[PDB]
Amino acid sequence: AGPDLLQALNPTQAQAADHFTGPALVIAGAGSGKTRTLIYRIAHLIGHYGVHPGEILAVTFTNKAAAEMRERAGHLVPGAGDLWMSTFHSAGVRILRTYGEHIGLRRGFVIYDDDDQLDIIKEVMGSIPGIGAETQPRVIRGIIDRAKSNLWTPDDLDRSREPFISGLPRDAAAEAYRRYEVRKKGQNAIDFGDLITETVRLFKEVPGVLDKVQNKAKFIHVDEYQDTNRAQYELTRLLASRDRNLLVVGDPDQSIYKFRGADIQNILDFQKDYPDAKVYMLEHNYRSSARVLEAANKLIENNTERLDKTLKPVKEAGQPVTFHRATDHRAEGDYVADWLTRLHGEGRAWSEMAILYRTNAQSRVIEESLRRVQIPARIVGGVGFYDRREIRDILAYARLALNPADDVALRRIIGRPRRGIGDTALQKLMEWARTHHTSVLTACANAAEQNILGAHKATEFAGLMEAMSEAADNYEPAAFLRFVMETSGYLDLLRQEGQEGQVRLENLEELVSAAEEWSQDEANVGGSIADFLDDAALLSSDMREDAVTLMTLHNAKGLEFPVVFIVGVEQGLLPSKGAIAEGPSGIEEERRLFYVGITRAMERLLMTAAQNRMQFGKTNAAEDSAFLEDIEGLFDTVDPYGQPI
Amino acid sequence: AGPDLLQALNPTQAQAADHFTGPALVIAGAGSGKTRTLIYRIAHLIGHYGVHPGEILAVTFTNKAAAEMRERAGHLVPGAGDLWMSTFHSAGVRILRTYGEHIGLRRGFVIYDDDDQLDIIKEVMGSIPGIGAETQPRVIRGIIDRAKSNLWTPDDLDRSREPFISGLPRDAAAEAYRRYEVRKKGQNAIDFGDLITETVRLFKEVPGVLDKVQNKAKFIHVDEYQDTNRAQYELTRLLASRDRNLLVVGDPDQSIYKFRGADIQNILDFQKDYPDAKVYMLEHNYRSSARVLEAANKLIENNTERLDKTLKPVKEAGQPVTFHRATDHRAEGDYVADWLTRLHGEGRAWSEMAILYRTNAQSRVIEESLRRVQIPARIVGGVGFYDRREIRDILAYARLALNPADDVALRRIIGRPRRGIGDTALQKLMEWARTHHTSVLTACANAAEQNILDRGAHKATEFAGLMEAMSEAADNYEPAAFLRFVMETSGYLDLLRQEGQEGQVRLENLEELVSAAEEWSQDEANVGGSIADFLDDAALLSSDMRTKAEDAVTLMTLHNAKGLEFPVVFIVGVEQGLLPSKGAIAEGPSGIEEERRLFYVGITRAMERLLMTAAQNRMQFGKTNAAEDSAFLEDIEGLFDTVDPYGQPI
DNA sequence: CAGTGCTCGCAGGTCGTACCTTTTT
DNA sequence: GGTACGACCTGCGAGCACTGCTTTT
Ligand SMILES: Nc1ncnc2c1ncn2[C@@H]1O[C@H](COP(=O)(O)OP(=O)(O)NP(=O)(O)O)[C@@H](O)[C@H]1O
Ligand SMILES: Nc1ncnc2c1ncn2[C@@H]1O[C@H](COP(=O)(O)OP(=O)(O)NP(=O)(O)O)[C@@H](O)[C@H]1O
Ligand SMILES: [Mg+2]
Ligand SMILES: [Mg+2]
């Protein structure tokens, strides 16, 4: 043990990793060693001040940094597994899974997925006066999710500034959110946002529970605090409130989540909320060559009313930062394609390189261009593996197995394994659930009996589901799924129309393969199948080698690569058609995004643009990004083969 | 040298049974020993004249007479096994199964039922000028079957006397028969009447075949010759023509089949057709008590223009013949029910008794009144066991398995084990067979390929694939287990199992079909029997196989009864409108006289007691109607004794 | 370009109609 | 009375037309 702070950390990084008690703010620029300090402190609390691992909580946004830090502390300090380290939402689960029965969340409270929460909205919209038969359900969800991100009730939504939200009348939307709650609450179901707001509701209402939890978080670490919303803050303040051992780390230049409700004021107001906090500032960049740093510092400079802090380079100015405008986007794909294999020959490993884009659609062209040259590719945050119809419906059987209520799942799974269950019979069964205010699954069992709703076809279904329930009380997750896949008939469907479907059944076996890992894994000892549906539904962009890493500019936050390709630096993408109509605040949100990208590169940064670009079936002229003007003369533009132009 | 004639037969019976070569007619009244002569000649040909059994043929109308003459043979004479004994239609089968190719019947031609005849008709009658729904199919079937009973061709039908037939224009009906032939023919298929006409057609065109068959029929016997139709006669004359050893037996008073197309002239004109024949006449009734005979003799007496022949009773006048008019038809069922039990305790066994009725609907009432009292009931000629959907649909798989072109069977099967097979796709499949002149089966295999009958393209390939599996299982497999295969693999058991509460008694019948298919191949005459051989045997069955699928009262029609006898016989529904029937009355005297022969046959079945009944009211299919005594009881009045529900005169 | 919705045409089940009653291979 | 056949809904599937690319636990 005995990790001298001064050995692996510079003097102020050391003094901050030495902070023991009280509120602390660690505020510094990109690649200044913020996270690394956060990892060394965790080791320094245990080894020096003798804090027990079980007293420590460290929370970030994406689960990629969460695992990073777990192991990261380990080869210094054992007990990475004794530490509580995850996202706010993962914590939200664990807390509400242990304490849910206090607030009216019973056994079988579900995790209603994003796509899942649409069928709910569609089913409320008919009842509501605010209309467009044209208003997209996902617009209503935008309102709701963001509202719980601000920690507002439907009543607080009646009183919001704007008389119209998105496309809607203030009171209409509020009412949707008011009938959304009643429906989902009556299904014993909670959504993403609830995992935060409901926890905040748990600590305010039952103070004795908070007290017991704060024993597990005595010493509280938060990375990426610049991206925390009002809810997350409120949860944080409540967890700190007893011992006030809260130490948050962040950068304001890096706050890219505003669209989802990120509050830049949370990191910038930290000492107004905690006057007694200590403030540590890091001025040095350890990550990048001075060549890509000067480029970053000159870009972010253009942002106005930002805290101006020193970021001084510690590395010699490296290989010049380059940009290439290729006539086509396909030639942009081939430029990156080509220049990956070149850099490879020179000795760069595939994994040390990564491709960053504004929006996901940009990845399709990139892939095939890699595929062509046969460059191993690893895409992060594409169309999910758990998004695919194959896997999704199986879990809908899995959810409905544990939760007789879910009618959002019943919709997807009643149809595909064709039981010939009627369309008009689905409406009367919804009129059965409408008249009885009832758990829908039992009405189908009672279809032959009672009010008699094609009669028996329902009794045979409740029997197939009871068979899943009895197989849900006892049987193993890996083989319980198989039971479902088989006995539902989904596997007989897929076999019967199987030529394209055979690759679909291949996915379905892989679900058993991933469920083997989950079960035979170390943290899952005696893990329930309900615990698996939990862990699947919260996954960020390991469950979701030596390959080029494709992904979005947003996802990248917190990582670093020796070589980084930023593609689609163009007016309309970087700063986006949305962010252009926003006005200065919009452009300045983007400028931070482009900043985060630039600060990812360690040795080389290669950025590209296209003269023409296609989006869904029309080719359009493309203009260089306004941001390249901001950095002009800090980079050398390049021809498809690599020389200045 | 064994079977001494003068011991078991009276002298003229003996002289007749002694006839060896040349045409011979034995013509006598009821219960005279005509059939009883027929063995003793057959036995006398073998033991005395040294005729070889394989040279002998004996023919009748009903398998019941095929049983009679087989038992009569075996239980009375050694070496009875090779004797060729069956009906005309059964003969037609065996002859056409052996020689068919000479006349253009391919290997494995299919034998259609009478029900079967209607998918063919319903297919053709849309194209012909005489329009349907006014004219239902079963009328057109009536013409064709009767046309071929006369041995006539569509052209001959254009030349019939009547300008209208049943409800139809002469040439319209003729045209339907002309397009029914071309259809049936193109399926490699033939109906019953063909089993005669085609055989007659086979002997006329190819002489060398007739010659080879006439070796097996050198000596020919025909019982019940009075009921033979024009075709049957023509088939007989041809089989006789070479050696002319034909001996026919019969009674004119007994000719009840005119509606069938029976020729009363055939037995009457025998010596005009065979001027060298011998004519033996039996004047004695061995069967019945003098009391049941006098009643018969005095009834038939009323018929006019019939040959007058003395039937003199040999048995003392027995228990008086009784008649009872019960208020209801139910009380008539109850009177029969009641009096059966009575006759039982006094020592009569159930089987010695039988109940005869005119039309089959009369049996339902009777049954339950037997069931009530719990009297064992053996019903002959009711709704067939092989008529039932369960059975019939399985054999439609069997037929179609052997014969790809059977679109009459395909209809009754393709949809039953629901395959998603198109209603509207059946019309496209029929427009495929209409456009291609093809058998239907290969259009289903060619579904995914070719013209692609879609919205279910795969559905048809999976069908023809289920049928090839039935073809290969038809290739080499046991009849018993081959049907099981069909029952399972078609999914017909699956349907009845799934909705199985009522369908369990149905899947029980399907067990019985495997049971009789098991009982059949175990049978002695079936050695190395093909399943094609079974379907042949099944579709020709008269009113053993039908009755099986003991010691019981026998229920059956007056018609079927022809040729049998019982010590006790009930005759029910002797009433104006049943005996002689509402049709027979409208026919006028010829009709009246037919029915009088029909009633005559009933009376002459009874050995010891005949008991006849009537109802004052009779329900048929809803409304209860006033019922009247039959005008025939008038004919026999003072001859019998009326009775009350308990047995004494009113 | 693609994923989703939404409407046409076709399978099968259930429910109300007409005719039945001659008789058999 | 019984059956056998012809007209009425529900049910599912495969070519339209359509419509959306921000960014995420
Ligand atoms: N005292 C040090 N000596 C050498 N390297 C260091 C030191 N401190 C930090 N680093 C390195 O600096 C790099 C980035 O550190 P990091 O913790 O990721 O900063 P960060 O602020 O969390 N990055 P970001 O979240 O994007 O702003 C890592 O490669 C560290 O190894
Ligand atoms: N010579 C006889 N000796 C003893 N019994 C006889 C003699 N002749 C006839 N019988 C019996 O009387 C029955 C009637 O004769 P049978 O020929 O069988 O009926 P049938 O003459 O054909 N009447 P039917 O069948 O209505 O035309 C026979 O079956 C014998 O039982
Ligand atoms: Mg960091
Ligand atoms: Mg006889």
Author numbering:
A (entry chain B): 5 to 457, 460 to 547, 550 to 552, 562 to 662
B (entry chain A): 5 to 547, 550 to 555, 562 to 662
From the paper:
UvrD is classified as a SF1A helicase and plays important functions in DNA replication, recombinational repair, methyl-directed mismatch repair and nucleotide excision repair. UvrD consists of two RecA-like domains (1A and 2A) that are responsible for nucleotide binding and hydrolysis and two additional domains (1B and 2B) that are involved in dsDNA binding. Here we present crystal structures of full-length and a C-terminally truncated construct of D. radiodurans UvrD (drUvrD) in complex with 3′-tailed dsDNA. Our structures obtained in apo- and AMPPNP bound states provide us with several snapshots of this essential cellular process and reveal a large-scale spiral movement of UvrD around the duplexed DNA.
A ternary complex containing 2 molecules of intact drUvrDFL, a 21-mer DNA duplex with 7nt ssDNA extensions at each of its 3′-ends and the non-hydrolysable ATP analogue, AMPPNP, was crystallized in space group P21 with four drUvrD chains and two DNA duplexes per asymmetric unit. These crystals diffracted X-rays to 4.0 Å. Despite being present in the crystallized protein, residues 663-745 corresponding to the variable C-terminal region could not be traced in the electron density map, confirming that this region is particularly flexible. In the structures of drUvrDFL and drUvrD∆C form I, each protein monomer contains one bound AMPPNP molecule, whereas in drUvrD∆C form II each assembly is composed of a DNA duplex with an AMPPNP-bound UvrD on one end and an apo-UvrD on the other. In both drUvrDFL and drUvrD∆C form I, the two drUvrD protomers are located on the same side of the DNA duplex and induce a bend in the DNA. In the case of drUvrDFL, one of the two assemblies in the asymmetric unit forms a very bent assembly (25° bend in the DNA axis) where domains 2B of the two protomers come closer together. The second protein-DNA assembly obtained in drUvrDFL crystals is more similar to the assembly obtained in drUvrD∆C form I. In these structures, the two drUvrD protomers are still located on the same side of the DNA duplex, but the DNA duplex is less bent (16° bend in the DNA axis). In drUvrD∆C form I and drUvrDFL, the nucleotides at the junction between the dsDNA and the ssDNA are poorly defined, indicating that this region is relatively flexible. As in previous crystallographic studies of SF1 helicases, our crystal structures reveal no direct protein-protein contacts between neighboring UvrD monomers, even in the crystal structure of the intact drUvrDFL, in which the duplexed DNA is significantly bent, bringing the two UvrD monomers close to each other.
